[PDB]
Structure formats: C-alpha cells, structure tokens
Write an enzyme that holds these catalytic residues in place. Structure first.
Site, short mmCIF file in Angstrom:
data_model
loop_
_atom_site.label_atom_id
_atom_site.label_comp_id
_atom_site.label_asym_id
_atom_site.label_seq_id
_atom_site.Cartn_x
_atom_site.Cartn_y
_atom_site.Cartn_z
N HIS B 40 11.17 32.23 10.35
CA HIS B 40 10.34 32.55 11.39
C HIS B 40 9.29 33.44 10.48
O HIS B 40 9.43 33.81 9.29
CB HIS B 40 10.99 33.80 12.25
CG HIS B 40 12.29 32.88 12.97
ND1 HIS B 40 11.99 32.20 14.01
CD2 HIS B 40 13.40 33.46 12.84
CE1 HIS B 40 13.24 32.14 14.41
NE2 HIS B 40 13.97 32.73 13.83
N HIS B 93 7.81 27.88 15.28
CA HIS B 93 8.26 27.72 16.83
C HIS B 93 7.37 27.83 17.80
O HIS B 93 7.54 28.21 18.97
CB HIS B 93 9.64 28.78 16.76
CG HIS B 93 10.46 28.38 15.87
ND1 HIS B 93 11.11 29.51 14.92
CD2 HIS B 93 11.08 27.17 15.43
CE1 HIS B 93 11.90 28.79 14.15
NE2 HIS B 93 11.91 27.50 14.41
CU LIG Z 1 10.46 31.11 15.11
#
Ligand SMILES: [Cu+2]
Ligand SMILES: [Cu+2]
Ligand SMILES: [Cu+2]
Ligand SMILES: [Zn+2]
Ligand SMILES: [Zn+2]
Ligand SMILES: [Zn+2]
Ligand SMILES: [Zn+2]
Ligand SMILES: [Zn+2]
Ligand SMILES: [Zn+2]
Lengths: 106, 106, 106
Positions: B40, B93
């Site tokens: 992330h 994401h």
């Molecule tokens: Cu992420």
C-alpha cells in the site's frame, strides 16, 4: 571534498549498486551513474535516514526512473546533514535486493 | 494529544483503510500500519488538502510502496496545518476504492 | 498574466502534450488538463530545469497519475523562477515521446 561514483547495475549484470556501502565526510558528493540493466531509481524511506525526517528522505530520493546509459544523479552530503546511515534501494529491483547505504561520518 | 492508528488492509482482507475517516485535533498524530494485502501507499493529491497546496500534499504523501507487515508511517497534524479535509488514496488499490479522509477540526 | 492550457493527449488520440512547447512570462500559469487516453502525469527531472535544482524539479513534478477526464494541475511560473527551459515528460507514455517544454522568458 571527494566524489564517490556508485554504479547502478554492476558491469557483469548483477542488479546491485556498486559499491553498495560508501562512507562520506561533510561536503562530499555521491554520484550515481546508470551502468547496466536500467531502469533504476534511488529511494530513501523516511525511516531510513538519521532522525527519520521525511522531508530529508524525500529530497534525497530520485524516484523518477533512470533509463539512459550514463544518466547520473548527485547528492552533496553537506555540513547540515545529520551524521549516521542513509539506507536506500532501487524500486524496480527491490526484489533482487538492489540496496545501498551511505554513511555520513560522525 | 492522541494517535489514531489506521490499518492498511482490513483484517478480513478488504482493500480499505480502517478506519477510512478520522477526525483529528491540532497536535494529533495519524499512524498508518501495514495490515493485510501489501503493498500500500498513501497519496494526497494537491487539490485534496485544504487550500490546495501542492507542497503540503507532497510532504504528506508517502508514495513509496510499503511491503512489510507492520511497516508504519505517521503524520502529526500540528497547529500550523489548515483546518479541513485531507483526502488520500492508495495507488495500487485505487481501482478498489482504497481511500481515506483525515479531518483537521475547525 | 496569462494562463496557457496544455491538453494531455490530443483530441485525435495522439499521446502528446498539446501544445508541447509553451513560452511564458513571470506571473503566467500553465494549466494541464486531462484530455485523451489517461492516465498521464508530468515529470521534470532534476537536470531538466534551469540551474538543475532538484527541489525545484520535485515541486513542479505532478508524479501522481491523473485518471479523470478534465483533471487539471497548474503551475504559476512566478518572478522567482529562473529563466530558461523546463523540460517535462509523461511517465506512462515516455516510450511514445509524450514530452513538453516550458520556456520562462529571459
Ligand atoms: Cu492499498
Ligand atoms: Cu535497479
Ligand atoms: Cu501520457
Ligand atoms: Zn571525504
Ligand atoms: Zn516510510
Ligand atoms: Zn485529539
Ligand atoms: Zn493533482
Ligand atoms: Zn504572458
Ligand atoms: Zn535525475
């Protein structure tokens, strides 16, 4: 004052910074030069520079990918740089352990 | 002063920041901690922080990918931070809507 | 003071900044607007701005990918910007030669 040349990608084709570890004194410059298997870049995480200054790590990071043979980037570790270790890595080749460490002598 | 822990990736495996929305007061810290499904990162667009300061958004952004379990990044929203909403997202994401919002109370 | 609109992606679908070269005067703004074939971003290498200031190139770079139609980013080339050429590129479309140049008149 000295300039330390760090090759990005060894001559043989190993995905490493050569040399990986360099000790510098205030006023010295590290020059990274694109050598084999580009692209490379040079990232210092905020927690990987002395005192964990994100401002410092960001300013030292050359996150833009370097594609061209002989393309270079230099940092002068001047008097106001804190002593300690500055650990960096190449994003494209992180998986291969393409990492380095500059030590500013105290 | 309080520290708000935001999990990157829910325990179940949802690609979200948990909690997604946090309200802070001047002096409070937000700590992001790598939880599930790395990598992330944490991006604030220049237009997504109060007053649209690119300098501010850049300094808050941890664009470097975070791979390791428990890897963390903190921002202290100090007295000189403008009141308002700071909207961020995870690049890997983005498609999944992995986004968040820090509100600095005015 | 003028604002120069640069389209990211031509109307026809060419992967270019349109217009690619712009001359500005101190106080003028360049506004980049997402036009065709997103994502795009806007990178200035440290060696591609006058005087090779990495701090300057970083602050001008919008490295975050721009996905949405009409998404925009502006830079005001104010009085304290050095005269000369500022050469930039789009990372996604570097291979296609999606590049530009802002000239600050001296
Ligand atoms: Cu992420
Ligand atoms: Cu590499
Ligand atoms: Cu592009
Ligand atoms: Zn020396
Ligand atoms: Zn970090
Ligand atoms: Zn509080
Ligand atoms: Zn933006
Ligand atoms: Zn003008
Ligand atoms: Zn460079």
């Amino acid at each position: 004052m000295e300039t330390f040349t760090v090759k990005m990608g060894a001559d043989s084709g190993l995905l490493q910074f050569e040399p990986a570890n360099v000790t510098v004194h205030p006023g010295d410059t590290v020059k990274w030069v694109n050598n084999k298997l580009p692209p490379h870049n040079i990232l210092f995480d905020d927690k990987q520079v002395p005192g964990a200054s994100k401002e410092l790590a960001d300013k030292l990071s050359h996150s833009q990918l370097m594609f061209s043979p002989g393309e270079s980037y230099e940092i002068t570790f001047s008097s106001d740089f804190p002593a300690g270790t500055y650990t960096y890595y190449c994003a494209p080749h992180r998986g291969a352990g393409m990492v380095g460490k500059i030590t500013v002598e105290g």
